[PDB]
Design a protein around this nucleic acid. Sequence first.
DNA 1: CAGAATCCCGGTGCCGAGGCCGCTCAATTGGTCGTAGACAGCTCTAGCACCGCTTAAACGCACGTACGCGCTGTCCCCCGCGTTTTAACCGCCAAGGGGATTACTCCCTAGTCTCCAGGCACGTGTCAGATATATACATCGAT
DNA 2: ATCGATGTATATATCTGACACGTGCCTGGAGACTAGGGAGTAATCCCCTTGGCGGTTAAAACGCGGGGGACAGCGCGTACGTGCGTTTAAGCGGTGCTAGAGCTGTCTACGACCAATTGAGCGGCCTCGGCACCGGGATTCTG
Lengths: 108, 108, 80, 78, 93, 93, 96, 96
Amino acid sequence: RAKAKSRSSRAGLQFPVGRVHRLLRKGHYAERVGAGAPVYLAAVLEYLTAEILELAGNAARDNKKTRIIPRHLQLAIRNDEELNKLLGGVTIAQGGVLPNIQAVLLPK
Amino acid sequence: RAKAKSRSSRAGLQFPVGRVHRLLRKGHYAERVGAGAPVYLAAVLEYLTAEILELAGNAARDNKKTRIIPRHLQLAIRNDEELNKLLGGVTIAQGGVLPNIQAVLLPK
Amino acid sequence: RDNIQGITKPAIRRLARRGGVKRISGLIYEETRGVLKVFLENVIRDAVTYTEHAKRKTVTAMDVVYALKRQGRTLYGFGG
Amino acid sequence: DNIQGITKPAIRRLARRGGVKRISGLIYEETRGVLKVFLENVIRDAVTYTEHAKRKTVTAMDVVYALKRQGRTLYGFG
Amino acid sequence: SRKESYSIYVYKVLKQVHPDTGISSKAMGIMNSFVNDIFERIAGEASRLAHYNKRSTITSREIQTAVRLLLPGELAKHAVSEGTKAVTKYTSA
Amino acid sequence: SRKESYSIYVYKVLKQVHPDTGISSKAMGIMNSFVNDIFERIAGEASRLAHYNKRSTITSREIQTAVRLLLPGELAKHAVSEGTKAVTKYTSA
Amino acid sequence: PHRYRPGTVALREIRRYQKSTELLIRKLPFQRLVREIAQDFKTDLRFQSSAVMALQEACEAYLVGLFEDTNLCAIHAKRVTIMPKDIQLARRIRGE
Amino acid sequence: PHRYRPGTVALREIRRYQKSTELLIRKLPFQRLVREIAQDFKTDLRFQSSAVMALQEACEAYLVGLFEDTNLCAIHAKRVTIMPKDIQLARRIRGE
DNA sequence: CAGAATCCCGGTGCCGAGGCCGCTCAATTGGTCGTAGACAGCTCTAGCACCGCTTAAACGCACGTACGCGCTGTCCCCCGCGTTTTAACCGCCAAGGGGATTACTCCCTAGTCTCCAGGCACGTGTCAGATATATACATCGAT
DNA sequence: ATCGATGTATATATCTGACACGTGCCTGGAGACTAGGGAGTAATCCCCTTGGCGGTTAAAACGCGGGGGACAGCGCGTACGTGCGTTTAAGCGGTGCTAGAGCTGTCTACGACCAATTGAGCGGCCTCGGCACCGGGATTCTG
């Protein structure tokens, strides 16, 4: 009997291909699930996770902090013209708002 | 082998309980479907159909017509505060708009 | 009851300040209270409906998350 | 450049159905741009559904599904 | 080949509400799409209710709760009343 | 009972993107909600795409089309390359 | 001679077009525009006769609603002439 | 004594509250309001400590967004003071 | 240009995040087998192209009046500052209602086979609605 | 007060193709029986929700002085609406071609279902340094 090797290690991903395949079967989305579906979906979820964490970390560094907090996630999402479109209907707890004042209101 | 009779006749409905039961099983909504689900859903769909047809038929007489057309359905929906809330996003072809002019625009 | 009066004038001003409003007319307070009450009523009706279907007696955070999700607004940080 | 086929009289007729009494001279060029932006987002989805099916003919159902995905359910075309 | 539609049942209802009125084919098409829409909405919500409680089956309780969530206050009371009447007549037949 | 979460995988990604930075529990809860949100959206569209074509099996083409329909242009452009590379390496192994 | 005062014909046209239900855009010029836009996505496409009709119905239903919203934000400023900034404000508040 | 001119402090408050993140409504009054409204639907209900916090976060986000929309409606009329008709217009265009 | 507000720096100190251990149940490897769907060939529907003709609609011009805009005046209702008071917030102590789990067993739904009638294409024909003509009577603008 | 020139609507007759009905038949709903595991019931644990007291300062309520904003009125000048004569090309009716949507047949590569094995990752515990609070100094900006 060959020594087991995880599917994620074969594909090179960090996310669990086995858990994704299990969730695809238990959700009743269809009666059959092809072998290629979970590798593709795991690769997409990993890409979007890293794409967000990079901007959040840059915001944390600009604030001179070392731990990421929800304020940094709000600042990351609302400053990107594409993330803000995908997550427009989402409110983040303790996120606050972006500084903005109408030019008509400032003093002469 | 007794003579077969439809479930709709037992329930006292016009809509097809058998077709609804088939459509539930073929949709993969769940692995099991109970006996009472299709009778309840058929009765609900029959109720909403009769209400729509009653209002459209009244709107037909107000125009001395004898045949219902999309304009009568549009007028029936947009003049009822309950149906208009349920069908707020729906667009009906050949329906047109309701007559309305703002009081500010009329002559002095 | 009088509990609607607990949303005081200073709290409404602080909310308006976060939104960038510089000057506020004195009639805005009763209008804001009327706008808030219907929102709370709509969300709570759905939350209690989910609580009753489960036969529970305590209202949990998930019932609120699902209610907001149904209204078309998604809340991140409490579950789901 | 067929956007010029949406003539000024047609825009005025649409404004009349909407109840507009008086119309400013710059509304026409703004409306053409708004319509041009609206059409592209629907056609891109219709073509995506057509390509997934490997068909070469765009079909009414592709448009019905494209509109429903945007929240604009259309009744009448099946 | 063979299609499938509700035009028979819609016509049967029409002749009960207004036995002197007819309906055009264009209006019948809209009435046919209306039932498919509401059917999909109710079955969708019933499936979510079943999944949240970790149940394998769909029952009249899921249909009733979905109706109470989807339909407005006055439509919901009547729809629930006659749905329960139909189920009681079926089970007592 | 035991509760599953993506916290360890999000942390592995963070350690790859910014080794010196850390993350608070609240940020982890937000990320854990964002992942389930996008998962359900993609699986939903892949399911609709299967029924419209009378197919009984979900495949990588359904995922690729759902990704092109849901994500904006540049994000979809990159995500499709990532998924194609992953599937190609998995099959070649 | 005979001549009507400004605004009476406009009100008569409003009462006219809110009663009828026909399409107001020319069919053939619209069809050529649909053909021109689709070419940027795929070549040699074909369109069913009903697809163009579905697109035309959707576009006209969208523009009528946009003008309905624009007129209210024109009246709010105590004007009667609609102007571009009214469209821009309506679209900004609608979130599109 | 030294006195700031009208509006100087308002801009400072705007900057202060846009830079902060805490909640702004008092917790006990809001909790009593929530328990009062719920009593109309079912009697003897109980609430988890987190459900009230979820409701408060949702309500404050909704009100801040509505004020953001109302301020654009005020400027369109060339005013500075917000008034009830601005709220009614914003809600009408949003379709609430 | 005096002075009130915000920021930052050095010191204290605590409890939230990073890391370790035990261990069990979810994922992997190997095998069988049934049917979903990939490929080849054919039929014939309906999408594309061209022509001639009539005349509905779009285009270009003149003109004059009703609207949009800028300026001035005035008066009253928001803002900023100070004092009093009221009920929010923190911390500590009690107790018991209700959520979450385990063990049993019964009754509900899925599956297979037969068989027969509900409802789907196809054909026919007759009357509801569309159109042309005549004319009634309502409204708008000037005297 | 009314005239009279335009416009919208109504009443009668003729036509035509859309709707309602009947026929043939086939495939999908109903009747009868069996097997098995999902849901219903009862009992136990214990946790987290409701209720109360004491007390101290952060926050709300009430007054008042004044100034800067909202609102009404006026003048003016040019942008848009109404009506005519000209010209563009939309709409329609007809014929012909062939691209490609929809279907039947064959068959073989794919995914589902079982069983045995073990290690990936979840729960409980430890601890130490990132953050926050206090106080004093430096810089900015406003009336």
